[PDB]
């Protein structure tokens, strides 16, 4: 089997991407944030505290003839950015782009943090990291991909995120028309539960490539590119007037600037992030200070190849017995 679904930016900045997902019988379609940095499929629901729901579409398990309470199971997650949610668990039928999993754990939120409430466009998350990170207790549950894998034509999914445009998540096949040149594959460590890999270096603009190992994760659920302070300083030093602002919480730059590209290495291959992808616009409406899309990972504890980086590539998440990651230009 295979599946193919379009993923759409939630706003004009590509802060996140939403993908329609069918849950239950008859189908209830919710727009979920596919997150290769976490491993829980959770939704706003009829059980979510009413004051914490503001415009989201909810899953109502009582209206699904295939929903079953997973008795005694609870979940609770805290994300790197400080947001969180928790609740109980149902199993139900879940379909993405024509690919159907029966008995998928659907984690129903009883509580969500303010950032989730305030984002009316995101009805929940669909985790695509390794199932070892799943938070359901006392019986850990599998991700949608893990459940689908055996049925898929090939045990892979691909992320093809757009810059200010829709893109695609495919399951079970590699669309050879969706990228240019070749896909370069690179080793993955699953030791921390992430799609963790080592980039071979970077360049700023038309500058020379610096060969240096940068361990990090491919994370579709993180907006920005978070890299070591040395690398980030070298990038922003090429932008007149750019500075790290403790009050804003990262690098800002004059909105009048033209940003240089940023290149990262994948083995001997190179992925170029155009300068415009690094512009996240005014820090507040009407400001001439703009927020940068490349930020320091210092104090996160891990480097994160988030959407800024991934949307410059066609990315293969190869879930074979020994997982790997593939990157192609597009």
Cis omega before residue 26 (within 30°)? yes
Give ranges for CATH 2.40.70.10 in the chain: 5-174, 175-330
Owner of token pair 């240089």: 260
- What was the elucidation method? X-ray
Residue in 14, 33, 35, 88 annotated catalytic:
35
Residue in 64, 85, 108, 199 annotated catalytic:
199
Separation of alpha carbons 153 and 136, rounded Å: 28
DSSP string over 279-322: EEEESSTT-SEEEESEEE-TTTSSEEE-HHHHTTSEEEEE-SSS
Resolution in A: 1.2
Q: Which residues contact 322 (CB under 8 A, 6 or more apart)?
A: none
| Residue 85 bears catalytic tag | no
Instruction: Name the fold adopted by 5-174.
Output: Cathepsin D, subunit A; domain 1 (2.40.70)
| Residue 4 bears catalytic tag | no
CB 158 within 8 A of CB 170: yes
- CB neighbourhood size of 321 (10 A): 5
What's CA 243's distance to the chain center, in Å?
27
Most distant CA pair in the chain, distance: 60
Q: Which CATH number fits domain 175-330: 3.40.50.80, 3.40.640.10, 3.40.50.2300, 2.40.70.10?
A: 2.40.70.10
CB 85 within 8 A of CB 54: no
Q: Which residues are 86's β-sheet partners?
A: 76, 111
Return the closest-CA partner of residue 14 out of 165, 218, 226: 165
SS3 of residue 150 by DSSP: helix
What's CA 128's distance to the chain center, in Å?
8
Separation of alpha carbons 252 and 290, rounded Å: 5
Under DSSP, the state recorded for 116 is H
Q: Is 324 exposed, middle or buried (0-12, 13-18, 19+ CB in 10 A)?
A: middle
Separation of alpha carbons 259 and 13, rounded Å: 16
Owner of token pair 């609740």: 87
* Angle 321-18-191 from CA coordinates, rounded to 5°: 30
């Amino acid at each position: 089997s295979t599946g193919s679904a379009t993923t759409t930016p939630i706003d004009s900045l590509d802060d996140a991407y939403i993908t329609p997902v069918q849950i239950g019988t008859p189908a209830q379609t919710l727009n979920l944030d596919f997150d290769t940095g976490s491993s829980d499929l959770w939704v706003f629901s009829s059980e979510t505290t009413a004051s914490e729901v503001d415009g989201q579409t909810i899953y109502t398990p009582s209206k699904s003839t295939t929903a079953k309470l997973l008795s005694g199971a609870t979940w609770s997650i805290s994300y790197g950015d400080g947001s969180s949610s928790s609740g109980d668990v149902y199993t139900d039928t879940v379909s993405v782009g024509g690919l159907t999993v029966t008995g998928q754990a659907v984690e129903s939120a009883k509580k969500v943090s303010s950032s989730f409430t305030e984002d009316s466009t995101i009805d929940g998350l669909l985790g695509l990291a390794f199932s070892t990170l799943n938070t359901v207790s006392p019986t850990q549950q599998k991700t949608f991909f893990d459940n689908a894998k055996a049925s898929l034509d090939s045990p892979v999914f691909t992320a093809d995120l757009g810059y200010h445009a829709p893109g695609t998540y495919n399951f079970g096949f590699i669309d050879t028309t969706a990228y240019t040149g070749s896909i370069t594959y690179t080793a993955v460590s699953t030791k921390q539960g992430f799609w963790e890999w080592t980039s071979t270096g970077y360049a700023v603009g038309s500058g020379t490539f610096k060969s240096t190992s940068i361990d990090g994760i491919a994370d579709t659920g993180t907006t920005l590119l978070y890299l070591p302070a040395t690398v980030v300083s070298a990038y922003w030093a090429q932008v007149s007037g750019a500075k790290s602002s403790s009050s804003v919480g990262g690098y800002v730059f004059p909105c009048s600037a033209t940003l240089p590209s940023f290149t990262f290495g994948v083995g001997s291959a190179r992925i170029v992030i155009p300068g415009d992808y690094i512009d996240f616009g005014p820090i507040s409406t009407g400001s001439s200070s703009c927020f940068g899309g490349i930020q320091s990972s210092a104090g996160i504890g891990i480097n994160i190849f988030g959407d800024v980086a991934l949307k410059a590539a066609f990315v293969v998440f190869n879930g074979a017995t020994t997982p790997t990651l593939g990157f192609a230009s597009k």
